[PDB]
Amino acid sequence: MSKITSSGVRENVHKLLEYSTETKKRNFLETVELQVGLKNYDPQRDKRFSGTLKLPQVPRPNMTICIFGDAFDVDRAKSLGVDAMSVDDLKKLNKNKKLIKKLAKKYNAFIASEVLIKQIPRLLGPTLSKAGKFPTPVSHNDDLYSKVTDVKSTIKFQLKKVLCLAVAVGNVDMEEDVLVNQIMMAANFLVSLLKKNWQNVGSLVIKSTMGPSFRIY
Amino acid sequence: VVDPFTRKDWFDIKAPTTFENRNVGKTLINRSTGLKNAADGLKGRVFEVCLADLQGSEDHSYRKIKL
RNA sequence: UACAAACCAUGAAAGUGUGGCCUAUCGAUCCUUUAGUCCCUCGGAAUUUGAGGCUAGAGGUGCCAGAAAAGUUACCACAGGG
RNA sequence: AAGACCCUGUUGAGCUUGACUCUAGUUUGACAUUGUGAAAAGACAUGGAGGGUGUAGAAUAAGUGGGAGCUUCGGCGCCGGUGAAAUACCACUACCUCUAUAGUUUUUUUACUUAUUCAAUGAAGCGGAGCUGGAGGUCAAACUCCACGUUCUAGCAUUAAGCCCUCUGGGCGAUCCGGGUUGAAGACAUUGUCAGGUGGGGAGUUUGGCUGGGGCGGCACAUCUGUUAAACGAUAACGCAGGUGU
RNA sequence: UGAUGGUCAGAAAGUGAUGUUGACACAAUGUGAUUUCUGCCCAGUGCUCUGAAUGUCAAAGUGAAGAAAUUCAACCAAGCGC
RNA sequence: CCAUCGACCGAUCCUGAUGUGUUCGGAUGGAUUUGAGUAAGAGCAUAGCUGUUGGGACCCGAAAGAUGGUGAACUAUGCCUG
RNA sequence: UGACCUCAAAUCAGGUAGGACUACCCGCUGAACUUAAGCAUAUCAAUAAGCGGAGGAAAAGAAACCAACAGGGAUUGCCUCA
Numbered sequence: 001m002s003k004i005t006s007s008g009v010r011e012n013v014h015k016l017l018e019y020s021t022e023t024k025k026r027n028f029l030e031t032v033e034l035q036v037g038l039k040n041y042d043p044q045r046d047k048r049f050s051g052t053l054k055l056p057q058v059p060r061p062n063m064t065i066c067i068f069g070d071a072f073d074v075d076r077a078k079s080l081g082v083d084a085m086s087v088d089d090l091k092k093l094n095k096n097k098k099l100i101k102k103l104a105k106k107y108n109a110f111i112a113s114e115v116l117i118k119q120i121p122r123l124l125g126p127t128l129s130k131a132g133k134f135p136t137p138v139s140h141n142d143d144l145y146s147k148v149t150d151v152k153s154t155i156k157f158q159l160k161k162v163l164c165l166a167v168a169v170g171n172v173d174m175e176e177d178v179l180v181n182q183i184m185m186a187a188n189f190l191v192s193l194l195k196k197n198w199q200n201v202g203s204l205v206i207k208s209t210m211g212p213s214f215r216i217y
Numbered sequence: 218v219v220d221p222f223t224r225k226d227w228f229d230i231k232a233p234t235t236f237e238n239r240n241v242g243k244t245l246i247n248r249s250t251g252l253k254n255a256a257d258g259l260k261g262r263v264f265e266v267c268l269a270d271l272q273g274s275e276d277h278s279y280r281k282i283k284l
Numbered sequence: 285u286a287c288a289a290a291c292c293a294u295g296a297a298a299g300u301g302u303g304g305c306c307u308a309u310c311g312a313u314c315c316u317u318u319a320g321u322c323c324c325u326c327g328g329a330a331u332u333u334g335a336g337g338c339u340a341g342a343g344g345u346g347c348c349a350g351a352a353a354a355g356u357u358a359c360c361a362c363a364g365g366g
Numbered sequence: 367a368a369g370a371c372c373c374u375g376u377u378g379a380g381c382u383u384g385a386c387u388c389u390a391g392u393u394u395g396a397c398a399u400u401g402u403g404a405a406a407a408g409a410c411a412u413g414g415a416g417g418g419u420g421u422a423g424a425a426u427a428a429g430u431g432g433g434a435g436c437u438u439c440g441g442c443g444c445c446g447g448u449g450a451a452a453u454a455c456c457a458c459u460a461c462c463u464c465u466a467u468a469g470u471u472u473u474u475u476u477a478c479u480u481a482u483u484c485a486a487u488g489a490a491g492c493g494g495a496g497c498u499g500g501a502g503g504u505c506a507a508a509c510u511c512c513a514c515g516u517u518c519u520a521g522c523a524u525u526a527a528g529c530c531c532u533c534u535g536g537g538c539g540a541u542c543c544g545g546g547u548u549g550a551a552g553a554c555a556u557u558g559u560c561a562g563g564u565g566g567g568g569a570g571u572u573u574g575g576c577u578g579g580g581g582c583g584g585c586a587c588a589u590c591u592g593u594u595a596a597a598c599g600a601u602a603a604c605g606c607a608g609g610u611g612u
Numbered sequence: 613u614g615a616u617g618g619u620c621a622g623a624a625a626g627u628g629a630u631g632u633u634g635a636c637a638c639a640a641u642g643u644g645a646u647u648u649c650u651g652c653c654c655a656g657u658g659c660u661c662u663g664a665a666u667g668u669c670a671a672a673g674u675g676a677a678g679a680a681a682u683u684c685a686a687c688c689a690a691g692c693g694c
Numbered sequence: 695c696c697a698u699c700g701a702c703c704g705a706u707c708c709u710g711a712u713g714u715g716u717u718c719g720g721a722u723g724g725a726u727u728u729g730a731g732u733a734a735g736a737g738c739a740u741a742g743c744u745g746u747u748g749g750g751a752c753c754c755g756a757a758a759g760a761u762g763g764u765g766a767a768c769u770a771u772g773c774c775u776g
Numbered sequence: 777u778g779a780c781c782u783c784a785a786a787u788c789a790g791g792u793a794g795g796a797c798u799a800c801c802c803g804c805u806g807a808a809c810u811u812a813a814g815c816a817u818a819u820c821a822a823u824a825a826g827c828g829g830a831g832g833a834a835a836a837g838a839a840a841c842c843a844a845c846a847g848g849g850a851u852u853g854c855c856u857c858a
């Protein structure tokens with residue numbers, strides 16, 4: 001039966017809010033990183049999975065971004081929008097292993113515009129991209145600041161080759177219960193992605209850059 | 218098919234001090250395992266060695282001793 | 285056996301062909317099994333397994349309208365029978 | 367004297383047998399009765415702590431979500447250069463290993479005794495220890511072992527003599543301790559329930575028809591050709607010459 | 613057949629016969645005084661003996677697939693087979 | 695009321711409109727098929743004869759089977775005492 | 777020198793059970809003749825016989841009921857369902 005315990009996660013985000021308001025810390029709010037256990041599966045043998053919905057509130061409170069290109073790009077994220085780019089290395093580079101490797105290891109997300117359909121599997125391809133990059137579906141007549149602020153809420157949950165995958169998002173600024181079920185509104189992918197779905201769970205841990213675990217599933 | 222000699226352990230035979238050349242020779246037995254110790258299945262063995270060997274002199278060539 | 289409604293074979297065609305040129309060459313209820321319709325039911329409401337139905341074959345009864353079946357009696361019994 | 371021989375009846379019975387169908391009993395297995403230890407091959411789980419590449423980073427990754435001297439210090443220092451992935455890292459998770467805690471865990475061996483099982487006695491002397499001698503040869507100091515009232519005789523042995531303390535009684539005589547009557551057997555037997563085998567010892571029943579009696583034979587029992595069949599058709603017999611289950 | 617036994621009894625039992633018994637005994641058969649002899653056959657049917665490896669092989673147990681009912685497989689006591 | 699040819703209802707097979715939870719719906723028009731039907735109700739009730747089935751079944755009749763009891767005053771065998 | 781627990785004895789003090797009847801009633805146990813035109817599952821029949829236990833009635837009884845409705849509402853009996 002579904003091991004959902006919102007009341008369990010309520011007292012837990014408070015115990016997280018303990019080492020993030022009470023107990024001890026630097027002073028304030030940080031990176032929420034509650035974990036699971038993940039058993040009853042198989043990193044090999046079966047296949048793959050993925051699931052991304054833009055989580056209720058804002059996770060990454062200081063998201064890192066590198067808007068690729070200029071064409072129809074930048075011109076949509078000038079002035080009030082920061083970041084952007086000035087091509088330059090889009091004609092050079094492409095031989096330097098770094099710079100693009102630097103861009104990947106520096107900033108946390110790029111874009112996809114409408115001209116990036118070339119660069120992602122051409123100027124990079126085996127050089128980058130497939131190594132762990134996700135172009136952002138952004139164009140002109142779109143949601144703009146709304147759908148790229150929702151990028152902070154655009155989580156993932158893909159499969160690799162480890163029975164770990166206990167990632168999390170959010171920050172402690174959230175009200176007493178703003179998380180709790182917001183994290184539960186992230187478990188939905190993680191459920192449907194596994195084989196027996198709600199069964200392939202081994203444990204569960206409430207934690208951040210501040211806690212250990214407070215007796216959870 | 219198995220070469221039973223890989224599991225054999227060699228032991229040294231010592232004669233009593235009444236004789237002179239107490240280094241009689243060597244024997245073997247299956248190596249000591251969990252079920253059977255090599256020691257207990259090894260006691261009770263009898264060696265028949267000529268007395269001339271136990272004393273060096275060839276005058277005892279016609280007597281043979283069981284140890 | 286002769287037609288009715290299909291789908292085919294053959295022949296230039298008319299025609300012929302619904303097993304063997306004709307007169308013999310074979311098999312119910314119950315059960316099982318396969319095929320068909322992919323249809324009806326499991327009766328508090330559903331899904332999927334399973335089960336049960338409807339139609340057509342096979343498995344067989346040769347004592348062949350189709351029980352499941354070894355002897356002995358001079359120790360013998362009963363109902364009868366010209 | 368409602369043939370006892372003979373036949374018929376979809377009537378029996380006594381008896382027999384690998385006839386059909388069963389059965390008491392018995393055998394074999396599993397579960398329960400069923401508990402306590404040790405060892406073996408091993409598997410696990412749980413607590414520890416610890417472990418790692420082929421290059422390149424001289425620096426040993428084995429993972430994936432992030433900042434900043436936390437620990438007086440500042441050894442090593444904290445994304446910027448070197449790798450596919452980074453040198454105090456941490457918040458913790460996730461795997462795996464090859465070391466340890468003495469956790470349950472399967473199969474084989476042997477220890478226990480309290481369940482269960484066998485036997486005896488008017489539940490009489492059990493278990494352990496100690497006195498006394500006989501030995502070991504003592505080589506420190508008495509450790510080990512043995513014995514601890516009866517054997518020429520077809521008699522007798524029963525309700526303590528004696529000693530100590532005074533307490534018409536207490537003790538020794540008759541060594542102390544444990545109140546397990548004493549052996550055997552033992553978690554196996556046995557017993558309970560299913561399961562496989564065996565089971566004329568026993569139970570129930572059956573064991574065609576036609577037929578010049580019945581039986582044996584044959585099939586005239588389902589059938590086909592020609593004829594008997596007597597000029598439509600029909601027509602019997604264990605009539606004639608033959609055929610079918612392919 | 614050496615008693616945790618042979619043969620037999622009982623529906624069961626903390627139940628019985630042999631048994632106040634112990635192989636010179638009890639129990640089961642065949643033949644049938646004495647004399648002289650009891651030949652060949654163990655292939656059949658029984659009875660009996662070993663089971664180290666070993667075909668078949670129940671329930672329980674084990675493994676796998678499945679959502680499960682279930683299915684499949686390995687192992688498999690005695691007996692049969694040898 | 696008789697023979698005959700039709701119509702309607704249900705089952706079976708064929709066709710498959712507007713439409714649609716796009717797989718449901720099933721208009722319309724057909725078919726040597728089929729029902730114990732419709733097609734201006736005839737039934738319900740009581741009684742009687744005759745006929746049917748189950749019953750003791752027109753009356754009497756077995757050899758057998760089962761359940762529960764009574765006998766070793768005869769007689770078979772053992773024991774005890776004469 | 778006294779409690780407690782367990783277990784005994786008494787012609788202790790005072791009580792209570794047994795046995796009977798058969799038509800009905802509550803249970804256990806349990807056939808076969810018979811029918812099937814044979815017969816074994818089946819039927820006779822959850823019947824006869826055998827055993828235990830009551831009363832004027834016994835038993836059952838105030839839902840771990842029936843339902844599938846617009847819901848009924850302890851048990852029992854008749855009529856019906858059938």
Ligand SMILES: CC(=O)O[C@@H]1[C@@H](O)[C@H](O[C@H]2[C@H](OC(=O)[C@H]3CC[C@@H]4[C@H](C3)O[C@@]3(C[C@H](OC(=O)/C=C/c5ccccc5)[C@H](C)CO3)[C@]43CO3)O[C@H](C)[C@@H](O)[C@@H]2OC(C)=O)O[C@H](C)[C@H]1O
Pocket residue numbers: 314315316343344
């Ligand atoms: C092998 C043996 O010696 O005995 C078998 C027996 O095992 C078999 O018992 C079956 C048994 O048979 C029956 O109960 C009857 C079914 C129909 C009757 C008869 C028996 O079979 C008949 C006769 C003949 O079909 C057969 O014969 C059938 C054999 C069969 C085998 C297995 C499964 C089903 C049928 C007709 C075609 C119609 O069917 C029928 C009309 O007489 O049904 C059970 C469901 C089956 O499991 C059961 O099968 C087994 C292995 O036990 O019955 C056969 C007649 C016997 O030959």
Ligand SMILES: [Mg+2]
Pocket residue numbers: none
């Ligand atoms: Mg034609």
Ligand SMILES: [Mg+2]
Pocket residue numbers: 311
């Ligand atoms: Mg047939």
Ligand SMILES: [Mg+2]
Pocket residue numbers: 312
């Ligand atoms: Mg048929």
Ligand SMILES: [Mg+2]
Pocket residue numbers: none
């Ligand atoms: Mg139902």
Ligand SMILES: [Mg+2]
Pocket residue numbers: none
């Ligand atoms: Mg339904």
Ligand SMILES: [Mg+2]
Pocket residue numbers: 338
């Ligand atoms: Mg129909």
Ligand SMILES: [Mg+2]
Pocket residue numbers: 347
């Ligand atoms: Mg016939």
Ligand SMILES: [Mg+2]
Pocket residue numbers: none
């Ligand atoms: Mg006939």
Ligand SMILES: [Mg+2]
Pocket residue numbers: 358
């Ligand atoms: Mg005679």
Ligand SMILES: [Mg+2]
Pocket residue numbers: none
């Ligand atoms: Mg005669």
Ligand SMILES: [Mg+2]
Pocket residue numbers: none
């Ligand atoms: Mg005679």
Ligand SMILES: [Mg+2]
Pocket residue numbers: 366
């Ligand atoms: Mg006559």
Ligand SMILES: [Mg+2]
Pocket residue numbers: 368
């Ligand atoms: Mg007569």
Ligand SMILES: [Mg+2]
Pocket residue numbers: none
């Ligand atoms: Mg007569």
Ligand SMILES: [Mg+2]
Pocket residue numbers: 376
């Ligand atoms: Mg007849």
